[model samples]
Target: DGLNGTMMQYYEWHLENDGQHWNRLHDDAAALSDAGITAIWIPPAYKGNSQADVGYGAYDLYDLGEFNQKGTVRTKYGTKAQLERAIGSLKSNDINVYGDVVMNHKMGADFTEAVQAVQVNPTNRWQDISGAYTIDAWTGFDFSGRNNAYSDFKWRWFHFNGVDWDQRYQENHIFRFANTNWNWRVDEENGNYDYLLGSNIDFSHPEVQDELKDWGSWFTDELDLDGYRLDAIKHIPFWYTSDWVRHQRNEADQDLFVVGEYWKDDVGALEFYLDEMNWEMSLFDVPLNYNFYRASQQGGSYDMRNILRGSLVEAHPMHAVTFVDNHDTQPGESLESWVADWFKPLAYATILTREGGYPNVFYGDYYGIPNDNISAKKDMIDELLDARQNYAYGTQHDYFDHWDVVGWTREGSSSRPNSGLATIMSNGPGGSKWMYVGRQNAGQTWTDLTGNNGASVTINGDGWGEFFTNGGSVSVYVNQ
Candidate 1:
């Protein structure tokens, strides 16, 4: 609801499974808030395949570490009590909590069923490779451990449309269940990217849709969450997601902020989704992240002027949640496109200082990923966050004319004192950019907040002053 609202993804792929993650989050709530993080997107709280599961392999939606399912009473993070406490602590600190919601598929079912299914081509899921035959698919989820404590819905093969493994055949193939059609309106990847992983839920089925919708309401109310971070939205049907989120908002009677993980580098695809969802939710600006990755990899060769050319934030800033890197982009992960350390500060500066897109900081980048020996960037990130919360406001003026050097300035709102700022960045050799800050800032001394540039500039009576940046770095000059 306010400008400079930043969200931090509070987990990584290789976080230590001490089951104290929720506790750690609870302890860091105040510090995180003080760092100007308006929202914290926590990992999936529901029980997954096991205690060590990262919650993407969602097994039980209702059992949020409260039941002894998944081989433990506590999840990879912690018990339900700890999870709620962490959420409460974050809310208490005025930092919104967005729960990660995994709705693509269910893994580690309790039982197997002899379901008639047809083998489909993995490359093109629309083509059937074999005739319908009975296969022992792990499609039954009794949730016996939960004992119908929350909901009495028992998942069977009928509720699902596909599975990857056949226990009887002892083989893994994309198997589409008999008498079921792949969900319409999914990403056109692989002919139809409807079936992602194990036990794909059939949104066409009334029972399944009702169950998920109910779960959305229950989960949001149970945790008192301010929003949700929808996982793997590209694989799921877009229409269903739109319907589900609308239902959630109607139930809550509040516009609970929802951002979906539609991992595609094509801005047009994301724009299409936004139109499909009727602009109800925001999406991560993946194309912008890739641009940062390319800039980092190529260094001086990449054009800084075209940085925001083909990104979601360029076209629809209101619907773009900009991030530099994330759990999927961390080292050794599936979507490993880690931005170089040298470029991280520049990237953070671009997202944090810019007058578009809601920025998100990654846990791996903010707190070191010990498993990968990647150190933290907390100090630099904190500095940028402070600038965002305090100085990033009002009208923005761009200086994206140079191939290697680009800059912008905020004309400072009357509401926020000392809010105006000028940001200069270079991907090649150091250079200066002549930009206008505002007539009100004329004759004022401005110093570089980011120590990358040492020299201060005195704004002339014309409201334009030259700002300098070091080679392959960024500098934010503000009133001293």
Candidate 2:
């Protein structure tokens, strides 16, 4: 149930430089496997609009389907054969591969031609758009012709007529329009609109559904794909996607593991989507990322505790995907960069070892933007993976009092008797020490897997006790 492992944005890798090194694909897969990773999430392998190097702007679904002229896989990453080979090598070692699937839109013909010619066109020939595009870039066009729809309508931005296509073109081509909104749909009623940055595809259309079903079937049948990570799911009609997932699962005759990118920070909104949609998984845990970022930057604080508590209350504890950082957020700004190497051991000690959701470990090179150190980042991830696989790879239960810090334990009965383990973590800026023992071992002697010290506990009551230290942190556990 754990998704905690390494993630590679193959699209970004290719965009950094021309996709020349074919061996890199295999090398990265091997490296993750060697590092004790259970799964690797890669970017979209389908043919992307060449105009955008990021590959999110998709052009052809058959990119991974058939061979292209470049003798390369239709995708920017590599050929389909190369991708299959990479998957084969990883799976040979029991590693799972989760491929990114974007159903947002098709790459515009104009965008593709521009990229092929290596020049930006002067005319904005895509589509007309307006309203709020991004939280960062607020002021822009108002396709409604009245005022910025995002500020005025809130969730109603999606309702603006022709605003979807209108703003799609405005942003893609960098048009300088003062009286327009960006691209975010504000109207909740207009959620079914077909507005997109590139050519908008009517997902509700029967033809589109057929194409999606065929694509999903091919991947599951031919590629032997284990799971799918959906991109921009919120933009599409929820009912359509729900049926699509069911169809894919039925066609594959296996539980199609899915995780969607709702991209909203609000927990209520996320929960609504999760309840309405039947997906095996979702990327709705960005709140956890935000909380980690705050705690790491400001030191262990009550905010961290609040974040954990909030998530525990709001999300299905065992199914959430915990992540410190991702491609969208780098290390320095990311929560992973705020905590020290030792802190990583503690962070994982809580999240990975606890009775919460699975974890997601990000791997990428952050530019020289402050605390961007790739080596340290990789090392931390490696240690976390090792700890999770070695110490905490099973069911977990939480044990905490009215303190800023919390404690939890993971117990699994393997062939080895002493495979069971427990951990405690402090959510405060300071560190503290505490001891936890379950009722099964109230008066037992145990060894600390972290190599701190060997201690004996009386387990005065329900196999739990408290030891005090400093720094608002504590994690004392015993393995039997």
Candidate 3:
């Protein structure tokens, strides 16, 4: 298995429909595998707030659509049996399963308790808003539905160092538990990025660390997950995450492909976080995604040459997980940095066809984002995925010397026949580029896999060909 294949974020169950996604995924798994998807980052399968929780507000880690726990028997995805079947189908087809892990905070508390907490600014958390006071916070979880099925350990106010709600005050405010300092070894956004939402777990607690470790081991064993997509990692302590990832791997006795979603456009911070983690995990290239978003909305005036600049994928590619967009970047989400549909293929090509970094194809982008009347880009993505698996290989060439048109070329490798690609795209009008493939491919005819242009180009004796694209579109040329 080469590192040239693509990954699919098997998308959402909430948007697709609850209690039925497992069947859908099970049905689609084989097709996705055939479509050159090497992995599927399935949404959180654990019980959340309810059937509509989208698996974010994790309530019970053990309840993967089993017993009714969080006001629902099945998660938004489907039942445990169905999910297992879907994973099996994917594994059968050689597609890795990556579980989405949301360990930042907890929701759907079963009880509330009075705790002393200091009020802090919701905007700038370092700026104290009030003194320590006793207020009831929703930081207790009994999991009555679970009936202590897996682990009987209950979560109390002390389990978390901070919460965002004051049950008595009935207001939205940042409350750092009294005598509890925000975890220092985490992201420095808004002073201390530790407190995000709900009862923010203090990874500093040894019990918390042990329990989360136990859950990770249990989860990997239960799901037989190939990897994990860690959620809101910046809010969690860096040291714990480093330890937790290694612990999970050691427990599983396998190399778990772990990635963290540290939502930030600052590549420096991302690079820094990766360094702090001691390179224990890869990270979503948020800066690269933002660059694509900004480049898309800026019209053709954007300097396409600079699109990959200042991106984690461009800097530390091996540890960068590239993606066009995700659930958070869709139409109306808070992290809505959606790249315009028009530029999606270009973005996809930039990640999929380029060397270095793993690319994650979003479910919304592949399928339709029905709520916004956005049609799926499946046809284009399918071709690119094919190109990635078959032709995006070996030595690479860059042609990002233009502001409107940027392209790259892949010199064929030895493992596969004619395994090379010449990709050219324009943000403005149609353009052409003379790029070299390999001396071995000289005099060969190349055709557009994207089919935006039926015309073909022939490589000269020197392996240089003038590749063209439809105005504001992409053309991926491979040997005929």
C-alpha positional error of residue 258 in candidate 1 after TM-score superposition, expressed in Å = 0.9
For residue 114, give model 2's deviation from the true position in Å.
Answer: 17
Q: What ranking emerges by TM-score with the best candidate at the front? A: 1, 3, 2
Minimum summed lDDT over a 10-residue window in model 1 is located at 1-10
Q: Which stretches of candidate 2 lie over 4 Å from their true place?
A: 1-22, 28-31, 65-76, 108-196, 312-314, 331-347, 365-371, 393-397, 402-404, 411-416, 427-433, 439-480
What TM-score does structure 2 among the candidates reach? 0.70
Please say which candidate is ahead in lDDT: 1 or 2. Answer: 1
Error of 3 at 15 (Å): 1.2
Report the C-alpha lDDT of model 3 over 1-480, residue by residue, as the tens digit: 564657888774328554888889889987888888889999989999877888888988889999878677888888999999999998898888999998889988888999998888776777788888899998889888777887898999898888878889897788888888888687887888888887888777889889999998999999999899999999888888888898998888666899999999999999999999998899999999999999889989999989999999899889999998998898888799989978998999999999978999999988878888889889999999989989999899999999888899999799888899999999999889899898889898999999998878999998899999877899999985
Ranking by lDDT: 1, 3, 2
- Report lDDT (CA) for all predictions: 0.91, 0.51, 0.88
Clash count list over all predictions:
0, 36, 0
- Pairs of residues clashing in candidate 3: none
Task: Name the top lDDT candidate.
Answer: 1
Q: Tens digit of lDDT per residue, candidate 1, span 1-480?
A: 455799999999999888999999999999999889999999989889988988899999999899998689899999999999998899899998898999989998999999999999999999999999999998789887788887999989998899999999799999999889999899998999999898998899888888999999999999988899999999898999999999999999555999999999999999999999999999999999999998889889998988888989999999999999998898888888999889999899989999889999999999888998888889888888888988888889998999989999997888887888999999899899899999888898889887788888999999989999889889998885
Model 1 stretches with alpha carbons more than 4 Å out: 1-3
